[PDB]
Amino acid sequence: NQYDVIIIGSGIAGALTGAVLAKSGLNVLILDSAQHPRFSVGEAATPESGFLLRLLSKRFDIPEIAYLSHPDKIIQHVGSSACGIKLGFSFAWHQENAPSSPDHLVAPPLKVPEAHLFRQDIDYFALMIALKHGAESRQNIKIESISLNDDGVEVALSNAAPVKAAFIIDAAAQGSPLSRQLGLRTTEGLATDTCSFFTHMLNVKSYEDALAPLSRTRSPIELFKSTLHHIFEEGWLWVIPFNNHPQGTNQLCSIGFQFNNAKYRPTEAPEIEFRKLLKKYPAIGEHFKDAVNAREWIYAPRINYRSVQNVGDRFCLLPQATGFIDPLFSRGLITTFESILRLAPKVLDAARSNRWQREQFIEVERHCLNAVATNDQLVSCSYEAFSDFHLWNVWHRVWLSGSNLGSAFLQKLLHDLEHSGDARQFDAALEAVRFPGCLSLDSPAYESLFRQSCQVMQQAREQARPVAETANALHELIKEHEAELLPLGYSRISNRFILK
Ligand SMILES: Oc1cc(O)cc(O)c1
């Protein structure tokens, strides 16, 4: 065995995984069929992924990882093109055959700013961290075959000798090449069935210029400085600027749109489908009067999948290779960084004791498969809440209250790790959470609210209930549980901009 671990994929997941393991004294080999620089999506950072990056940084003593958690540190250390800013998520509702109202808006702001990750620059910087810590990288290779045995892993490569290792990690946000070989990938059982078109554009107007200024919306933040979601019956469109930072030099804006395939199936080329969508929703079209594509539109007819298994004796699929649901709420990155945090110490224990059995990595699988299941519920119920604004206003508080509890929990673990400096206590605290993969992590009150809310949403879809009743049902449930949530005034429905 030439190496200890082989990592497929050299984007942010595999790069950070290689960084922490190489730092810890393993001989890592990162493999990739693509080569840097390259384009990538999964751009919206969240407070959770912010804390999880700072946790990775502190747990393994790699300060450069912490730089990726804050837009000012990104600009300073990665580069001035490497991110835009975000002061919150924001959602603006629309319907076919009616003018869009700037009062049909929700946008809960952040205290601490976050990044819109320009992934080509962030991913390359991440690989840099890995390379500087001893990990070998090989780009632009083709994997003929992967063989899993009792004594190791062997990877065959085109125009090169095969490479042997103790363990293999699949960190490809790609078509899960190892999961496709193992036959673990499936669409069966997913509530979500969504397609996606996405690209980067130039000369995209801000929300303030194109639809409605700050004086009309009454928002505490510019929507230009937010992860903007345009939502409507059959799906949603994102507007994620990289050109909204005062110190930034990036001119592009990420643009993507998703359809619920149960409601609408696209039939034509992306650019035709794009012009049809803007005719249907003319207010959304005001963003793109002067706009130009800076790259080819990528179409993906089915973005949703899950896996029945993701760990074995001598392999592990990281969440991005295990399953994906939807870019909505940007749960992809959260699941990924948390999985690396759980997996890394166990792979070290395995390598330091030469024990490679499925049993050891079983809590990595539990977290990952739950996170994809919870993310499926969240998104599918959210796609149903798109049908009316008032319903969306009440529903988004379910996501928000959970997300806040998740964040506060990760602050607690970060604060306790910073104080005590005890890596063993942290690993155990993380594994001992009552609801791994779920939004709150360790709150029985919230997971009660989430479960019953999703039951109300899925019942409302099945029986086609009136939106005013469903909204009230959820409003009651929020009032019932509000004492156990944080004191942010979630039940006050007239407040559409929930402060901290
Ligand atoms: O995007 C987010 C906004 C907010 O106010 C809280 C949170 O956890 C996420």
Residue numbers in the entry: 2 to 501
Structure paper excerpt:
A bacterial halogenase PltM was originally identified as one of three putative halogenases encoded in the biosynthetic gene cluster of pyoluteorin, an antifungal compound containing a dichloropyrrole moiety. Recently, PltM was elegantly demonstrated to catalyze mono- and dichlorination of phloroglucinol, yielding, instead of a biosynthetic intermediate, a compound that serves as a potent transcriptional regulator of the pyolyteorin biosynthesis, whereas another halogenase, PltA, which acted on a peptidyl carrier protein loaded pyrrole, was shown to generate dichloropyrrole. Herein, we report the wide substrate profile and the unusually large halide versatility of PltM and its crystal structures that reveal a unique recycling mechanism of FAD. In addition to its remarkable halide versatility and a very broad substrate profile for a phenolic halogenase, PltM is at most ~15% identical in sequence to other structurally characterized FAD-dependent halogenases, and it contains a unique C-terminal region (residues 390–502).
The nearest carbon atom of compound 1 that can be halogenated is ~4.5 Å away from the Nε of Lys87, further supporting the model. At its entrance, the substrate binding cavity is lined by charged and polar side chains (Glu115, Glu49, Lys501, and Asn405), which would interact favorably with hydroxyl and amino groups on PltM substrates indicated by the activity profile. One face of the phenyl ring of 1 is in nonpolar contacts with and Pro48 and Leu111 and the other face stacks approximately orthogonally Trp400 and interacts with Leu401. The phenyl ring of compound 1 is stacked nearly orthogonally against Phe90. This residue likely helps orient the substrate for halogenation. The hydroxyl groups of bound 1 are within hydrogen bonding distances from the side chains of Lys501, Asn405, Glu49, Ser404 and the main chain nitrogen of Phe90 and one hydroxyl is bridged to a carbonyl oxygen of Ile499 by a water molecule. These interactions underscore the importance of the unique C-terminal region in substrate recognition. The substrate binding site is large enough to accommodate a diiodinated 1. The substrate binding site is situated relatively close to the protein surface, which could allow access to larger substrates, like resveratrol. The halogenation center is nevertheless restricted by the helical C-terminal region to addition of up to two halogens; a trihalogenated product cannot be sterically accommodated and neither can halogenated l-Trp.
